[PDB]
Ligand binder design. Structure first.
Ligand code: MG
Lengths: 182, 52, 70, 263
RNA sequence: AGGUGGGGAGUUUGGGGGCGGCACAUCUGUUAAACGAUAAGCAGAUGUCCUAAGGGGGGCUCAUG
């Protein structure tokens, strides 16, 4: 019934991972697998350690929001929660850091030149003779307008534009392949 | 020259491979980042933009 | 209670407190390292220390100084 | 096509790593007791648990390439392969992988006195909840082998790294103990693994602030014998401890105001 | 031999930043790997909503005997 627990050596706690360490002396006499009291001693030691960890864990602050269920990503105000601290144990990583980036020639040119990066304003470009935005790329853009239009006043020239666009795409792919070796 | 010549410096630095970006006044003193800044001390196109 | 209150003397060469003000300005510049530029303006009654303090900061007479308010 | 791209995105290294996936491979000598032990381990590893189709004939110590190949093809960082030889009775192997390459190898064997989960008293247990841990004995931190075992167990069972925990989430605790202390140079005593369910006895003696913690053992009860061990090189250890790198007289005061000290 | 080499001389010092963008039911020349099936692209009358990704939700199971 009593909850008091104490040890001679101060206990080390890892609240960031719900773990604790107890460097206290281990009783080899009773820990032997052949002993029957072994199980009871292990149970008592585990209970004491868990009591100490819970006492230390509950001392952490707890958040209390004023919101409601709301969306699926919300949190209920009623559910009190303990704010755990940052992790302390430096567990080994599983993969390296992908700090490597693309050294494409464009970045070097931009660094050398004063050309600031594009602001990515939007897809809605403007055209004429249609009374509509007709965005550049994304849905029935001006790229296919030259093929769709039925007057090419200037041998089939409609296919030549598509061939030129495909050649530009191939050139972009070749540039990508060349930069992949950086 | 020989070292004083800017051609030798360009060859040594390897910028000749990308000489297309040669800025007017490319020298050891006051490189492009400074030449362009100073050129501003040397806006009235009256263009008609479509404010849509 | 509300200001640093740096003691200063406006002697052109035998200035007092110049080092403290220089250190304060250096600290302010360190705070604004990302700005790369900063300027300090002077406010006060005429002929108090403005031109003389500026000159002693520069260590030489640059701005005209005389016992005259203007 | 986007489905494959989503998987490849997870395959690539992430700044914040998710729960380390565990792959279980039954060896050529997958005993029925070994199968039960694997099932019990999976019960404490779900839902981030994967089991192979059938038996295997892979020797991690005599063949490291197959483990790396399986990890790469399954994107699993943690690997477990249970295999018991005539000399190494009830032996179980645990392996970690860094960048699809072998990180370390450790042999763990369970004594015949082990008790399965079904043998213990039935109690509620929710999958996916992060359990608590308790380490007893200075050897856990003062010894290399025990430190590695502790790190492996934590990485296997620490689950997510969330900074917010529910009070009701503390359902059970894992007791990590050793078979008594030992002198320098002596054989390493077997590691004792126990799992205890938590009971919230009223705080009559402890007033209201803290309840009387009670424990009920549910198993599995395992004593881990120490066999062959492999460790990574210092360079690999340093690589595995890298940080994402994510200010003189600069501090963000309350309300987000950027204040400083004049000195 | 190599090097400093407007210290010296002749000369100019013109008239310009963003852009590429489509996926499936089709048939034709190459590809065709040659007892063949007919694939992994090129360009084409061909559309179509898959809003240039099919993301979710609810259902069906399939070549071939
Ligand atoms: Mg004055």
């Amino acid at each position: 019934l009593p909850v008091t627990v104490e040890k001679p050596i101060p206990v080390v706690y890892d609240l960031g991972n719900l773990a604790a360490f107890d460097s206290n002396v281990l009783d080899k006499n009773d820990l032997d697998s052949s002993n029957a009291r072994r199980e009871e001693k292990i149970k008592s030691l585990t209970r004491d350690n868990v009591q100490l960890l819970i006492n230390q864990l509950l001392s952490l602050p707890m958040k209390t929001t004023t919101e409601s269920v709301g969306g699926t990503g919300g949190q209920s105000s009623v559910m009190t929660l303990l704010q755990l601290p940052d992790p302390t144990t430096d567990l080994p990583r599983e993969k390296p850091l992908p700090k490597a980036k693309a050294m494409t020639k464009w970045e070097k040119f931009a660094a050398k030149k004063g050309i600031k990066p594009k602001e990515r304003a939007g897809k809605m470009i403007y055209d004429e003779a249609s009374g509509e935005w007709v965005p550049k790329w994304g849905y029935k853009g001006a790229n296919k307008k030259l093929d769709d239009q039925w007057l090419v006043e200037v041998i089939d020239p409609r296919t030549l534009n598509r061939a030129e666009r495909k050649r530009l795409v191939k050139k972009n792919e070749k540039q990508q392949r060349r930069n992949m070796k950086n | 020259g020989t070292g004083k010549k800017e051609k030798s410096r360009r060859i040594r630095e390897g910028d000749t491979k990308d000489g297309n970006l040669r800025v007017k006044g490319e020298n050891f003193y006051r490189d492009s980042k400074r030449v362009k800044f100073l050129n501003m001390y040397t806006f009235q196109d009256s263009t008609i933009p479509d404010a849509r | 209670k509300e200001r640093p209150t740096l003691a200063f003397h406006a002697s052109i060469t035998n200035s007092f407190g110049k080092g403290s003000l220089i250190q304060l300005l250096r600290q302010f510049s360190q705070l604004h390292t990302d700005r790369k530029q900063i300027s300090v303006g002077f406010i006060g009654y005429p002929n108090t220390g403005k031109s003389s303090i500026i000159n002693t900061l520069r260590k030489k007479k640059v701005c005209q100084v005389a016992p005259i308010p203007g | 096509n986007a489905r494959a791209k989503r998987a490849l995105v997870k395959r690539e290294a992430k700044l914040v790593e998710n729960v380390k996936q565990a792959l279980f491979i039954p060896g050529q000598s997958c005993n029925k007791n070994l199968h039960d032990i694997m099932v019990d381990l999976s019960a404490l590893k779900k839902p981030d648990m994967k089991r192979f189709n059938r038996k295997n004939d892979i020797h991690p110590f005599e063949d490291m390439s197959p483990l790396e190949f399986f990890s790469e093809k399954n994107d699993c960082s943690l690997m477990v392969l249970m295999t018991s030889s005539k000399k190494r009775k009830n032996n179980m192997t645990f392996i970690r992988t860094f960048g699809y390459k072998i990180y370390d190898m450790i042999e763990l064997m369970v004594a015949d006195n082990f008790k399965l989960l079904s043998d213990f008293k039935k109690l509620t247990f929710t999958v996916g909840l992060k359990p608590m841990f308790t380490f007893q004995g200075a050897a856990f931190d003062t010894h290399p082998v025990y430190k590695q075992i502790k790190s492996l167990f934590l990485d296997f069972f620490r689950g997510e790294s969330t900074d917010l925990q529910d009070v009701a989430g503390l359902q059970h605790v894992i007791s990590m103990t050793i078979q008594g202390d030992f002198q320098d140079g002596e054989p390493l005593p077997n590691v004792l693994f126990r799992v205890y369910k938590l009971k919230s006895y009223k705080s009559d003696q402890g007033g209201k602030r803290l309840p009387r913690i009670e424990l009920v053992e549910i198993g599995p009860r395992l004593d881990f014998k120490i066999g062959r061990i492999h460790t990574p090189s210092p360079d690999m250890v340093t690589e595995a401890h890298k940080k994402p790198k994510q200010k003189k007289n600069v501090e963000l005061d309350i309300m987000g105001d950027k204040l400083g000290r004049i000195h």
